[PDB]
Structures are given as structure tokens and as C-alpha cells.
A paper describes a structure:
We could not measure any phospholipase activity but the enzyme shows robust nuclease activity.
Here, we have determined the crystal structure of the luminal domain of the enzyme at 2.3 Å resolution, revealing a bilobal structure with a catalytic site located between the lobes. We then compared the structure with published crystal structures of other human PLD family members which revealed that a number of catalytic and lipid recognition residues, previously shown to be key for phospholipase activity, are not conserved or, are absent. This led us to test whether the enzyme is actually a phospholipase.
Numbering used by the authors: 72 to 97, 101 to 490
Write the structure that this text describes.
Amino acid sequence: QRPAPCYDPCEAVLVESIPEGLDFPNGNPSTSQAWLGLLAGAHSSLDIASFYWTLTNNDTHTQEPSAQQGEEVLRQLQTLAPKGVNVRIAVSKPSGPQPQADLQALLQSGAQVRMVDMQKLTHGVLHTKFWVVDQTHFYLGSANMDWRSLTQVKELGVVMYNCSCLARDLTKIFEAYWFLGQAGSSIPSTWPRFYDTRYNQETPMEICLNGTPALAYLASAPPPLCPSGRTPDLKALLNVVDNARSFIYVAVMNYLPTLEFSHPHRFWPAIDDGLRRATYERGVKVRLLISCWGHSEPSMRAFLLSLAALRDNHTHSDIQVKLFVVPADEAQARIPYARVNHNKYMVTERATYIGTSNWSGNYFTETAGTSLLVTQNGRGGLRSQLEAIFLRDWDSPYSHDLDTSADSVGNACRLL
Ligand SMILES: *[C@@H]1O[C@H](CO)[C@@H](O[C@@H]2O[C@H](CO)[C@@H](O)[C@H](O)[C@H]2NC(C)=O)[C@H](O)[C@H]1NC(C)=O
Ligand SMILES: *[C@@H]1O[C@H](CO)[C@@H](O[C@@H]2O[C@H](CO)[C@@H](O)[C@H](O)[C@H]2NC(C)=O)[C@H](O)[C@H]1NC(C)=O
């Protein structure tokens, strides 16, 4: 019936990037600190699933002092293969030709690197970001292999420490990326047993998490990349939504009930109707915190206003939407593709979901993504820490109702 429990002493830590100048009145380790500490303690293996690499000023054609943390991350990674650590890096194939200075330097250092052509395989991209260290620890979250991800962009991830069972489960997902990064690869009709898992929505892994029992599993996207035991990302996410009885707090960079960039536009109401059902059938309080910046897709506005219109005193329907805007001063505004909140996570009164994907259809049907799902009885824990980060952001001055003036938010914002 139920698969074997895990005996490892797992400890989870939420790790954040807080961009320079973003202040919150009255603390977690930073992505940069957590990463440097994962590298310093690596003795055998490092697997990185990645979207792109821009860790240096040279990569972005800037001269920013705040790129130093990214350049120190690259320097540490270059010491790993020479000292005997097996480094494997899966990266998304860019759509055109692009310079690959970081990956060259790591190849030169002895790391193995495979480009994955998800466009050929699924019409999507390899979007996931995660690290697996020594088959024991992993990072899963929103931060890219990008110096801007350490200092100029707001990020949210988790580091699971001392949790070899779950790290090995994550390595299985990595191994599918690693296989597909080979010449002549196609998606097998059936994935071999080597990739399958017992740990999923129906039977999550029983773990001991910061000293108390928890239920954890890893979900994966797109469906072609899921062996039969592997819960698909979208199914995991909708299960948290459908099980919520008091609130759903969602902080995601983009939300769009469409299959974004489809030449014939394609409506995609899967998550939308989940949130509508939750609030109308079960009286769930839904708070959606969507990021906004100069690159936001302007069609988001009408769909977000559609959701917000459901608030009704007498139906106990209570959806609220805010936009989170990272301010950019003059010098910051010259950094390409920065000053935005990249977080992607969901928390309810009983469950956590930490993902790598934005909430539009292609991320769940074509593009590679992963998410960690944890449930755990008892006040406190990982779940209350994530709720606290959400409420911090929701109540901060960086969060704005949809009627807010564009000239109040401290940055370009296409949704206002
Ligand atoms: C993960 O496991 C390591 C190794 O067991 C823990 O590190 C040790 O913690 C003990 C007791 O807390 C210390 O006395 C040692 O100095 C640590 N290093 C060793 C034993 O090599 C670590 O605390 C656990 N948690 C995390 C987040 O790393
Ligand atoms: C689970 O254990 C981890 C590891 O001890 C906790 O993370 C530490 O939290 C303190 C503050 O409480 C930080 O100053 C440390 O830097 C963190 N350690 C590491 C290795 O990052 C985490 O808070 C614990 N979570 C719960 C819910 O108890």
C-alpha cells in the first residue's frame, strides 16, 4: 500500500534574494549565502537544472558592483570539478545563437554541460531551477544562474538539508533532463523504472522535517516528462487549491489563464476556475500577489480584474489582487531585466507549494518545471514561515491595489 518512510533528519530553510534598497521594517539566509555554503560543503556531486547563465558583468554588458556575488558564485563553481566533484549542468537551449562564457569556463574547469532542446521535444523550454548536492541537499526555487538573481531581483526558494531520500527523488527529474540533452534524444513512450517514483500526491514521502512528521513530494512538468508515479505540476497545484478550507495566498510573477504566445490565442481556465471554486464553494479567502514591471504582459490586467470582481459581502466570496512592484532608481533602471519580484509559491492554512514556474498554461503543458509540496500537522514550521513572508510582502508599501496610479509605484508598470 504505502511506500517506505524516510529516516533522514531533513531541515528546510526558506532562502530569499532581497534586491538592494528594498526594506522591510523588522530574517532568513540569502540565496547567495545558501548557495556559497552548498558549494563549500560539496564533496562528490552537483547537479544543476538551469534556464540560462549570466553570472558576470561581462555577460550583461554592465559595470555594476552588485554583480560581485554572482561572480564569486561562478568562481566557486569552477573549483568543484578540479577537486573531484562531479558537476552536471543541464541548461535550456537558447532560441538563437548566444554567447556562453559561464558554461565555457565551467567546461574548461571539468564540469559536464548539456543543452536541452525542449522546443524540439515539447515546444517548450527548460525553465526549472534547482541544485542537488551530494545526493543529500537541494535548492528549489525562483533564482536563476544570474547575478541579478542575487542582488537586483526578489527571489524565493527553499534549501532542503540532510534529506537524501528527497534529493534522490529530485535527481530522477534531473536525469530525465540529462537524457534529453543528448543528440538524437526523443521522449520515450515509457520511461524506464530508473526514473519512476513511489512518492506522489496519492502517497507522499513521510519525512521527519525539523523534528516533526511531514508529508512531502516533488511534482514535475510537462506531462511527457513524467513517469507514471510522478505527479504532474498542474495536478499538484490544483490539489492544494481544492483542499484549502480557509485561505489561499499566491505570490507569482505572472498569472495568465491562457496558453501565452499562441498565434491563435488560447484560453486556459484550469487555475482560474480552481480559485473561483475555492472562494465561491468553500468561502476560501484568496489573496493573489502578482508582480509588475515594464515587461509585464498587459492582457493580465483584465483577467486579474475579472477575479477581483468576485468579492461579494453576501456570498462570502473574497478574492483580492495586489501588484508587487520593486522600485528602481535611475542607476538601477539601467540594469537590463532587473527590479522585479520572481517569486512563485502558494500557501494555504494547511499546505505549501514552492515552484519554478509562472502560472500560465504553457508552463504546465510544454515547459519543464518542478514544485515541492509539503503538508505538516501543527502550528509553525515551513508553512507558517512562508505565510509570514507572504503577509510581509502583502502588507508592505511595495504592494498596490489595481486602481493604484502608475506614478505611485516607483517603477515602470504596464498593468497600472
Ligand atoms: C545537517 O547535517 C550536518 C551533519 O550531521 C549538521 O552539521 C553538524 O551539526 C552538529 C550538531 O548540530 C555540529 O556539532 C557539527 O559541527 C555539524 N557538522 C558536522 C557534524 O560535520 C547540520 O547541522 C545539519 N543541518 C544543516 C542545515 O546543515
Ligand atoms: C529548520 O532548521 C533550519 C536549520 O537549523 C533552520 O534554519 C536556520 O534558522 C536560523 C534562524 O532561526 C538561521 O539564522 C540559520 O541560518 C538557519 N540555518 C541554515 C542552515 O540556514 C530553520 O529555521 C528551521 N525551521 C523551523 C520551522 O524550525
